[PDB]
Amino acid sequence: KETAAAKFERQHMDSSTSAASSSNYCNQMMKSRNLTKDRCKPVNTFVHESLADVQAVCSQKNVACKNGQTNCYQSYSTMSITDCRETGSSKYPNCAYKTTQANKHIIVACEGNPYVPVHFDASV
Numbered sequence: 001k002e003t004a005a006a007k008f009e010r011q012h013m014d015s016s017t018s019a020a021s022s023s024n025y026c027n028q029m030m031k032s033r034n035l036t037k038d039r040c041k042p043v044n045t046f047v048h049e050s051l052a053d054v055q056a057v058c059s060q061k062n063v064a065c066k067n068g069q070t071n072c073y074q075s076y077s078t079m080s081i082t083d084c085r086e087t088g089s090s091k092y093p094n095c096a097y098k099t100t101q102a103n104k105h106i107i108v109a110c111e112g113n114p115y116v117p118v119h120f121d122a123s124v
């Protein structure tokens with residue numbers, strides 16, 4: 001089916017905007033991208049920069065992955081991001097999220113050939 005690269009774009013990419021859309025961006029975005037279908041995805045990050053800018057991060061600052069792997073990279077520049085965190089009040093299937101806009105360095109895990117992002121590890 002959909003490649004790991006493809007999944008990363010659907011789960012974390014959103015160039016169409018510049019900042020945290022609205023207070024209900026995560027509620028909408030999380031639902032639109034299919035991350036609340038089988039269970040309220042607890043935490044998810046959408047990045048607002050060109051696909052090219054994000055792909056570029058795979059050749060930037062090599063840093064250790066949270067899982068101990070060495071295939072993670074941190075962006076030299078900060079990027080516009082929107083963090084989506086599940087509210088406690090949240091209730092499957094009515095997954096609810098808090099929306100937080102920030103400008104930070106992202107850390108992603110890359111794999112394959114081409115060497116592209118397949119996992120969002122962290123923002124710092």
Ligand SMILES: Nc1ncnc2c1ncn2[C@@H]1O[C@H](COP(=O)(O)OP(=O)(O)O[C@H]2C[C@H](n3ccc(=O)[nH]c3=O)O[C@@H]2CO)[C@@H](O)[C@H]1O
Binds near residue numbers: 066070109111118122
């Ligand atoms: N070093 C590495 N560590 C982990 N996985 C690695 C890897 N290198 C490659 N892979 C591969 O990527 C696939 C997709 O990764 P995930 O299933 O974690 O999907 P998300 O990033 O959407 O889901 C993750 C990231 C997201 N998250 C976490 C923190 C945050 O700031 N933002 C955010 O979006 O929350 C979820 C849990 O933390 C894996 O199956 C694996 O094969």
